[PDB]
């Protein structure tokens, strides 16, 4: 077959949305509290994640249909999925040769050891890197990468969502685009759609573990004080 006009426009809009919210130069990173190598990396990684939440919000706003949901559903979707979108979009700076995220300098090269100096343990980080390796080996086209972020964000099985029918219909429309793209445009992707759906289930498990560990972190005033207001709101339990 052949991809349709509406499917084409969706892909174009999502790729443009990603290009507008992901800056390959990483030059904004000098504006964060500097990295230091008791939780010497938490200020820098809190700033990195806070910055990235703002980018994911800008991305969400350009997903076709997302802005038509109620503000409450948008926020519910964003709050539940933010850490997952961040884990996905970070694959773009992840390197197999270094087994770390490299963002334009040795100061902004993040390995597993750096994240333990931000309060997290191998219970999260070991699965997280295996996720990055397996996702890197999928060799996603940019179109697929951005579709998967939009699909992850538009999941209806999140706590706090009201219009479950409308959100599932949006997500279904993106899955169909992704399935048609893989069939037509990606040589040898017979098993790829299923592998990408499986990555979404990996993300759910990494979300749970991050949330557990974030709670232990954020309940200590000496540590929550080093977070940012946006991180506290997005990852918080306030309803």
């Amino acid at each position: 077959h052949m991809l349709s006009d509406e499917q084409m426009q969706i892909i174009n809009s999502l790729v443009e949305a990603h290009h507008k919210t992901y800056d390959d130069s990483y030059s904004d990173f000098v504006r964060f509290r500097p990295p230091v190598r008791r939780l010497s990396m938490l200020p820098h990684l809190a700033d990195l994640v806070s910055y990235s939440i703002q980018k994911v919000i800008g991305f969400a706003k350009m997903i076709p249909g997302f802005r038509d949901l109620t503000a409450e559903d948008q926020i519910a979707l964003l709050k539940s999925s933010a850490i997952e979108i961040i884990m996905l979009r970070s694959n773009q700076s992840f390197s197999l040769e270094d087994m770390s995220w490299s963002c334009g300098g040795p100061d902004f090269k993040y390995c597993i050891n750096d994240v333990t100096k931000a309060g997290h343990t191998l219970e999260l980080l070991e699965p997280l890197v295996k996720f990055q390796v397996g996702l890197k080996k999928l060799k996603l086209h940019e179109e697929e990468h951005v579709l998967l972020m939009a699909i992850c964000l538009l999941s209806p099985d999140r706590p706090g969502v009201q219009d479950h029918v409308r959100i599932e219909a949006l997500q279904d429309r993106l899955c169909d685009v992704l399935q048609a793209y893989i069939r037509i445009q990606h040589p040898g992707g017979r098993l790829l759609y299923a592998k990408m759906i499986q990555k979404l289930a990996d993300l759910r498990s990494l979300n749970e573990e991050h949330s557990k560990q974030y709670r232990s972190l954020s309940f200590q005033p000496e540590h929550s004080m080093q977070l940012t207001p946006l991180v506290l709101e997005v990852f918080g339990s306030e309803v």
């Binding site: 409450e72 559903d73 948008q74 926020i75 709101e233 997005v234």
Partner: peptide
């Protein structure tokens, strides 16, 4: 209500 999330 969320103060900052009300830039949704």
């Amino acid at each position: 209500r969320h103060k900052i999330l009300x830039x949704x």
